[PDB]
């Protein structure tokens, strides 16, 4: 990429979420969403492999129709209130549209089909951006409008996502898609507490970002899109085997690690609000997510899969190092739990 183009695109992919967050005029929030859609598509097809064009053409159609639905909500509001922004008075259907639409861009629940497929055809790098710096934008729009959205729908999309994400993940063996599925699940918890305590959504996101960003830079350190590929981690780079183990169990909710806090406080907030029906079912299938996380643990760490002689060759050569971010984001993530009170 002519480095100039790289700058323009990257600026847009970054001006995209930032305009959304900063503005209050919904319109300006919509174009922030629009710029993110335009900026991400070029990077998605960088290899320009036949799989890639498929990825982008899906991502784009799914993103575009949702963008149009979000605009329709703003256009309708403009007639029901002269304001260009959702208010207490807003017709309920107007808000529900925004939930569905925004739940498509974020890819939650019954609209979770595009994400796993686009996460499969894009590079590991652009995978991260597509999973974590593109969720900030839509979530911002929701978090702003939380007082007004429906508790019922969110919960249904929340629970569905948790289930779909979990069930989908169990079968998958491609890593990119295992992560895509996890993201659907975590995204679910996040949207469950939005109606009740938005501030916790912003924790269940950061922690997801501080967990997923190290996890993916791990997958690419050896650029392994297969579990079999990550399983030979012990030969290619032995040290990351320890933290890859804890980060994945952290992604699932197991108690000593940082990953428990988001689930724990979301459950505490939902019980405070009396959803002890919903919270219980979510926590239970949340346990399904750890099963596929630990199955990967087995292959990568607890058991040593057989490797190839040609690997000895890759050992010889100095391994290009993992950026510092890996460490700082691996530790702050695997073990901050002793510092939970301040985090919340």
């Amino acid at each position: 990429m002519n480095p100039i183009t790289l700058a323009i695109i990257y600026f847009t992919i970054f001006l995209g979420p930032v305009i959304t967050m900063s503005s209050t005029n919904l319109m300006l929030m919509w174009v922030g969403l629009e710029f993110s859609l335009l900026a991400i598509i070029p990077m998605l097809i960088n290899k320009k492999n036949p799989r890639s064009t498929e990825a982008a053409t899906k991502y784009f159609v799914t993103q575009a129709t949702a963008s149009m639905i979000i605009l329709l909500a703003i256009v309708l509001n403009y007639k029901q209130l002269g304001t260009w922004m959702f208010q207490q008075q807003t017709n309920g259907l107007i808000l529900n549209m925004t939930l569905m639409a925004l739940s498509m861009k974020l890819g939650l629940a019954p609209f979770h089909f595009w994400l796993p497929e686009v996460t499969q055809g894009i590079p590991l790098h652009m995978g991260l951006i597509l999973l974590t710096w593109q969720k900030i934008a839509p979530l911002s729009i929701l978090i702003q409008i939380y007082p007004l959205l429906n508790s019922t729908i969110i919960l249904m999309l929340a629970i569905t996502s948790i289930f779909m994400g979990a069930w989908g993940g169990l079968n998958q063996t491609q890593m990119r898609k295992i992560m895509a599925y996890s993201s659907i699940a975590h995204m679910g918890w996040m949207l469950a507490i939005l109606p009740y305590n938005p501030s916790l959504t912003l924790l269940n996101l950061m922690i997801y970002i501080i967990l997923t960003a190290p996890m993916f830079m791990a997958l690419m350190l050896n650029n392994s899109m297969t579990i079999n590929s990550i399983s030979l981690l012990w030969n290619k780079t032995p040290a990351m085997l320890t933290m890859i183990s804890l980060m994945l169990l952290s992604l699932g909710g197991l108690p000593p690690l940082t990953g428990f806090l988001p689930k724990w406080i979301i459950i505490t907030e939902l019980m405070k609000n009396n959803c002890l029906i919903m919270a219980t079912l979510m926590a239970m299938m949340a346990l399904l997510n750890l099963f596929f996380y630990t199955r990967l643990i087995y292959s990568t760490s607890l058991t040593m899969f057989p490797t190839n002689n040609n690997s000895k060759m890759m050992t010889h050569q100095t391994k290009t190092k993992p950026n510092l971010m890996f460490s700082t984001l691996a530790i702050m993530s695997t073990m901050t739990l002793p510092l939970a009170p301040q985090l919340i």
Partner: protein, 42 residues
């Protein structure tokens, strides 16, 4: 003797585009490692 490290066969299962292969799903084949399909002369 020595803790059983996984043999080739234990490894085999984790290959294939889906762990728990379905009736028609199994018919599929793992994605190309290069991420570029052999496709066709077109």
């Amino acid at each position: 003797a020595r803790q059983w490290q996984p043999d080739i066969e234990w490894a085999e299962q984790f290959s294939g585009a889906v762990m728990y292969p379905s009736k028609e799903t199994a018919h599929w084949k793992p994605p190309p490692w290069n991420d570029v399909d052999i496709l066709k002369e077109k």
